[PDB]
Amino acid sequence: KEKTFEQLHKKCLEKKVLYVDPEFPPDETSLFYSQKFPIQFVWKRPPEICENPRFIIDGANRTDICQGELGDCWFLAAIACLTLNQHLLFRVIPHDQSFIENYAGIFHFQFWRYGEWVDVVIDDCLPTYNNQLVFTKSNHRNEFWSALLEKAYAKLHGSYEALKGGNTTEAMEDFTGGVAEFFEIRDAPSDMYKIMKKAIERGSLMGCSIDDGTRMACGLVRGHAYSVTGLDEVPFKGEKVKLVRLRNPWGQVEWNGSWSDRWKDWSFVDKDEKARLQHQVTEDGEFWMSYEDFIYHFTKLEICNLT
Ligand SMILES: [Ca+2]
Ligand SMILES: [Ca+2]
- Catalytic residue status for 224: yes
Please report which ligand is nearest the Cα atom of 261: 2
Annotated catalytic residue within 12, 66, 73, 304: 73
**Do residues 219 and 261 lie in contact, with contact meaning Cβ atoms separated by under 8 Å?**
no
Q: By what technique were these coordinates determined?
A: X-ray
- Catalytic residue status for 248: yes
Q: How far apart are CA 200 and CA 227, in angstroms?
A: 11
- Catalytic residue status for 125: no
Distance 72 CA to ligand 2 centre (A): 22
Tell me which residue of 264, 241, 24 sits closest to 122, measured CA to CA: 24
Residue 47 CB neighbours (<10 A): 15
- Residue type (1 letter), 303: I
Distance 57 CA to ligand 1 centre (A): 5
Distance 92 CA to ligand 2 centre (A): 27
Annotated catalytic residue within 9, 12, 248, 279: 248
Write down the CATH superfamily of domain 178-307: Cysteine proteinases (3.90.70.10)
Q: How far apart are CA 238 and CA 295, in angstroms?
A: 23
Domain ranges in the chain are: 1-177, 178-307
Q: How far apart are CA 235 and CA 95, in angstroms?
A: 41
Q: How far apart are CA 70 and CA 171, in angstroms?
A: 16
How remote is the C-alpha of 82 from its chain's centroid? 8
**Do residues 38 and 222 lie in contact, with contact meaning Cβ atoms separated by under 8 Å?**
no
